[PDB]
Design a protein around this motif. Structure first.
Motif, PDB file in Angstrom:
ATOM      1  N   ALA A  36     -16.345 -12.243  10.265  1.00 53.52           N
ATOM      2  CA  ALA A  36     -15.015 -12.858  10.065  1.00 53.52           C
ATOM      3  C   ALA A  36     -13.908 -11.861   9.646  1.00 53.52           C
ATOM      4  O   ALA A  36     -12.723 -12.105   9.866  1.00 53.52           O
ATOM      5  CB  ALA A  36     -15.159 -13.972   9.018  1.00 53.52           C
ATOM      6  N   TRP A  37     -14.290 -10.723   9.068  1.00 52.57           N
ATOM      7  CA  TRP A  37     -13.410  -9.640   8.622  1.00 52.57           C
ATOM      8  C   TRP A  37     -12.738  -8.858   9.766  1.00 52.57           C
ATOM      9  O   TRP A  37     -11.680  -8.279   9.534  1.00 52.57           O
ATOM     10  CB  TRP A  37     -14.262  -8.708   7.744  1.00 52.57           C
ATOM     11  N   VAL A  38     -13.303  -8.832  10.982  1.00 53.75           N
ATOM     12  CA  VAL A  38     -12.945  -7.855  12.041  1.00 53.75           C
ATOM     13  C   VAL A  38     -11.445  -7.787  12.354  1.00 53.75           C
ATOM     14  O   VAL A  38     -10.884  -6.693  12.368  1.00 53.75           O
ATOM     15  CB  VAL A  38     -13.777  -8.103  13.320  1.00 53.75           C
ATOM     16  N   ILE A  39     -10.769  -8.914  12.590  1.00 51.30           N
ATOM     17  CA  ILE A  39      -9.355  -8.912  13.010  1.00 51.30           C
ATOM     18  C   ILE A  39      -8.395  -8.567  11.855  1.00 51.30           C
ATOM     19  O   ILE A  39      -7.605  -7.633  12.028  1.00 51.30           O
ATOM     20  CB  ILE A  39      -9.004 -10.188  13.804  1.00 51.30           C
ATOM     21  N   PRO A  40      -8.472  -9.195  10.663  1.00 55.39           N
ATOM     22  CA  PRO A  40      -7.730  -8.743   9.482  1.00 55.39           C
ATOM     23  C   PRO A  40      -7.949  -7.263   9.133  1.00 55.39           C
ATOM     24  O   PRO A  40      -6.990  -6.549   8.844  1.00 55.39           O
ATOM     25  CB  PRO A  40      -8.194  -9.646   8.336  1.00 55.39           C
ATOM     26  N   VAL A  41      -9.189  -6.769   9.222  1.00 58.88           N
ATOM     27  CA  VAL A  41      -9.525  -5.343   9.067  1.00 58.88           C
ATOM     28  C   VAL A  41      -8.859  -4.484  10.143  1.00 58.88           C
ATOM     29  O   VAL A  41      -8.314  -3.437   9.810  1.00 58.88           O
ATOM     30  CB  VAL A  41     -11.053  -5.138   9.045  1.00 58.88           C
ATOM     31  N   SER A  42      -8.833  -4.902  11.411  1.00 58.42           N
ATOM     32  CA  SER A  42      -8.235  -4.097  12.488  1.00 58.42           C
ATOM     33  C   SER A  42      -6.690  -4.069  12.446  1.00 58.42           C
ATOM     34  O   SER A  42      -6.048  -3.069  12.794  1.00 58.42           O
ATOM     35  CB  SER A  42      -8.772  -4.592  13.833  1.00 58.42           C
ATOM     36  N   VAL A  43      -6.054  -5.133  11.943  1.00 64.12           N
ATOM     37  CA  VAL A  43      -4.620  -5.116  11.582  1.00 64.12           C
ATOM     38  C   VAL A  43      -4.380  -4.211  10.367  1.00 64.12           C
ATOM     39  O   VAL A  43      -3.498  -3.352  10.403  1.00 64.12           O
ATOM     40  CB  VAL A  43      -4.100  -6.550  11.341  1.00 64.12           C
ATOM     41  N   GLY A  44      -5.220  -4.319   9.335  1.00 65.96           N
ATOM     42  CA  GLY A  44      -5.160  -3.503   8.132  1.00 65.96           C
ATOM     43  C   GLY A  44      -5.253  -2.015   8.415  1.00 65.96           C
ATOM     44  O   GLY A  44      -4.514  -1.219   7.832  1.00 65.96           O
ATOM     45  N   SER A  45      -6.199  -1.728   9.295  1.00 67.27           N
ATOM     46  CA  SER A  45      -6.368  -0.325   9.668  1.00 67.27           C
ATOM     47  C   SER A  45      -5.116   0.220  10.349  1.00 67.27           C
ATOM     48  O   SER A  45      -4.681   1.335  10.058  1.00 67.27           O
ATOM     49  CB  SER A  45      -7.574  -0.157  10.591  1.00 67.27           C
ATOM     50  N   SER A  46      -4.536  -0.529  11.271  1.00 67.72           N
ATOM     51  CA  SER A  46      -3.316  -0.111  11.955  1.00 67.72           C
ATOM     52  C   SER A  46      -2.163   0.069  10.972  1.00 67.72           C
ATOM     53  O   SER A  46      -1.424   1.051  11.049  1.00 67.72           O
ATOM     54  CB  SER A  46      -2.927  -1.130  13.026  1.00 67.72           C
ATOM     55  N   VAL A  47      -1.953  -0.900  10.064  1.00 66.39           N
ATOM     56  CA  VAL A  47      -0.904  -0.815   9.053  1.00 66.39           C
ATOM     57  C   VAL A  47      -1.162   0.380   8.139  1.00 66.39           C
ATOM     58  O   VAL A  47      -0.230   1.100   7.770  1.00 66.39           O
ATOM     59  CB  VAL A  47      -0.813  -2.114   8.220  1.00 66.39           C
ATOM     60  N   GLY A  48      -2.313   0.621   7.714  1.00 64.49           N
ATOM     61  CA  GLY A  48      -2.680   1.778   6.912  1.00 64.49           C
ATOM     62  C   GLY A  48      -2.338   3.098   7.578  1.00 64.49           C
ATOM     63  O   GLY A  48      -1.797   4.001   6.936  1.00 64.49           O
ATOM     64  N   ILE A  49      -2.774   3.135   8.974  1.00 63.81           N
ATOM     65  CA  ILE A  49      -2.478   4.345   9.731  1.00 63.81           C
ATOM     66  C   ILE A  49      -0.966   4.554   9.801  1.00 63.81           C
ATOM     67  O   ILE A  49      -0.480   5.673   9.632  1.00 63.81           O
ATOM     68  CB  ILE A  49      -3.077   4.282  11.154  1.00 63.81           C
ATOM     69  N   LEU A  50      -0.242   3.425  10.009  1.00 65.69           N
ATOM     70  CA  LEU A  50       1.215   3.503  10.049  1.00 65.69           C
ATOM     71  C   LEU A  50       1.772   3.960   8.705  1.00 65.69           C
ATOM     72  O   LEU A  50       2.686   4.787   8.657  1.00 65.69           O
ATOM     73  CB  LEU A  50       1.814   2.146  10.429  1.00 65.69           C
TER      74      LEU A  50
END
Lengths: 50, 48
Positions: A36-50
């Motif tokens: 259930a974590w995958v999509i919130p984590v993949s948005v989080g990762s992008s925002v973090g990278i940004l």
């Protein structure tokens, strides 16, 4: 099943008296929580990278 | 049936609802039954 066509297990009785036959208990272990974590984590990762 | 606080919406709705059932008869496929309905221990899952 025994010879009489009936199933016996740990809790079986005759005349209310537990038979205590001695069937084994085996443990199976390692099962885990679902993705259930995958999509919130993949948005989080992008925002973090940004 | 499971109450609304027991539903993990991403597991049910990562795919459209269009293919949860057979188009020829409109019964839902067996894999979604225990995800939507609670049943007792030792129950015959083919009966519902």
């Amino acid at each position: 099943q025994f010879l009489d066509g009936n199933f016996y297990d740990l809790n079986s009785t005759i005349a209310g008296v537990p038979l205590n036959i001695g069937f084994p208990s085996r443990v199976f272990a390692g099962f885990a929580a679902l993705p259930a974590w995958v999509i919130p984590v993949s948005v989080g990762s992008s925002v973090g990278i940004l | 049936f499971k109450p609304g606080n027991q539903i993990d919406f991403n597991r049910l709705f990562t795919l459209p609802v269009t293919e949860l059932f057979d188009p020829n008869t409109m019964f839902v496929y067996d894999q979604y039954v225990p995800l939507l309905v609670n049943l007792p221990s030792g129950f015959d899952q083919a009966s519902i």
